[PDB]
Design a protein around this ligand. Structure first.
Ligand SMILES: [Y+3]
Ligand SMILES: [Y+3]
Length: 377
């Protein structure tokens, strides 16, 4: 199993109910100032979206709203691929981007071995080159990209950026200003990229809807290729969509300004630390044939508490620590022995194995609870 890459992080992850605080500490392309509370030195509403104002006051240049002349995507065979894992690399790319008219953007995520989820890779494409960034290696440095991502002068093409926007700020403190979401454009014109790649370029990117562990290093050529495929064709599609969209408004920036309006709203989405109550599940088991008595129901609350505790600490997801069906099983079975717990999970999760004693005690506690009148055996 891959060594968890969170261990090499200079700054630990805050897995606490504590409210998420934006990470950005310097605001490039800042129409409105950024609170001094967010200053790198002092470490207004710090808990507010940092680029709230600029996104609310942004409009697509007339240059992009005019009948576009699509520029066919460069042949993958003749398109250079650059791997970026060091600060110099990152800083040099930014400069390059700052001189761009528009560029593609997509990310690679991972959530199984993480509590909040983790961005493992970022992809960007210019009209001529494909870039791949190691956002695990360059984690604390990524913020630099804000200079080019928050520049209303340059257009950032995305495909379904809803989640991306959220990740960019949770992990690096990166925000996007001036973004054209191709999934928003597909909604008007009337699934998406699978089609967008086959309808506009006549290409069938196989590993596109494939789930893979992006924490893996080195990244094999296959994933490197599947990663670049997510941004190599977006600028072309970006052009070809404003075309077949301008060819509908009779030559008026009607449906174009809408895609930009909607997309910039996705940029306003903010990240919020998730919260979980065992109430949700208990209410679900009730709709079902809930025969959970005082004891069993207690065990569930104790296991739910223990899993949430463990997950947040160990920085793992609930599924990894102990999945629903498995927790629920133990809650019902109420195994008297520690092995009775283990022999109730298929397969036995590592943390359960390691905290077997701890879990045993919880279940025992539940077994000492007083059974109601109607609950008597
Ligand atoms: Y992907
Ligand atoms: Y409760």
């Amino acid at each position: 199993s891959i060594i968890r890459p969170q261990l090499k992080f200079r700054e630990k992850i805050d897995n606490s109910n504590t409210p998420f605080l934006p990470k950005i500490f310097i605001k490039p392309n800042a129409q409105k100032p950024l609170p001094q509370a967010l200053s790198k030195e002092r470490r207004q509403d710090m808990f507010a979206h940092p680029y709230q104002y600029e996104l609310n006051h942004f409009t697509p240049a007339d240059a992009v709203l005019q009948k576009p002349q699509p520029q066919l995507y460069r042949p993958i065979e003749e398109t250079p691929c650059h791997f970026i894992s060091s600060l110099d690399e990152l800083v040099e790319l930014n400069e390059k981007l700052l001189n761009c008219q528009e560029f593609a953007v997509d990310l690679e995520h991972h959530s199984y071995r993480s509590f909040l989820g983790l961005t493992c890779l970022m992809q960007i494409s210019t009209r001529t080159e494909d870039f791949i960034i190691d956002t695990l290696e360059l984690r604390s440095d990524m913020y630099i990209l804000n200079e080019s991502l928050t520049d209303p002068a340059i257009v950032k093409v995305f495909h379904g950026a809803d989640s991306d926007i959220e990740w960019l700020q949770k992990d690096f403190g990166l925000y996007v200003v001036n973004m054209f979401d191709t999934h928003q454009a597909a909604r008007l014109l009337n699934h998406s990229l699978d089609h967008l790649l086959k309808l506009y370029c006549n290409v069938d990117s196989n590993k596109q809807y494939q789930l893979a562990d992006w924490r893996i290093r080195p990244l094999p050529e296959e994933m490197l290729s599947a990663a670049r495929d997510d941004t190599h064709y977006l600028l072309y599609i970006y052009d070809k969509m404003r075309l077949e969209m301008w060819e509908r408004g009779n030559g008026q920036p009607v449906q174009l300004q809408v895609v930009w309006q909607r997309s910039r709203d996705i940029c306003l989405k903010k990240f919020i630390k998730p919260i979980f109550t065992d109430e949700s599940y208990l209410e679900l088991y009730r709709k079902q044939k809930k025969h959970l008595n005082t004891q069993q129901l207690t065990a569930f609350q104790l296991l739910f508490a223990w899993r949430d505790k463990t997950a947040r600490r160990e920085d793992e997801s609930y599924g990894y620590v102990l999945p629903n069906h498995m927790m629920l099983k133990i809650a019902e079975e109420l195994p008297k022995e520690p092995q009775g717990i283990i022999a109730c999970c298929n397969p036995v999760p590592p943390l359960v194995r390691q905290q077997i004693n701890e879990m045993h005690l919880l279940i025992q506690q539940a077994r000492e609870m007083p059974l109601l009148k109607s609950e008597v055996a």
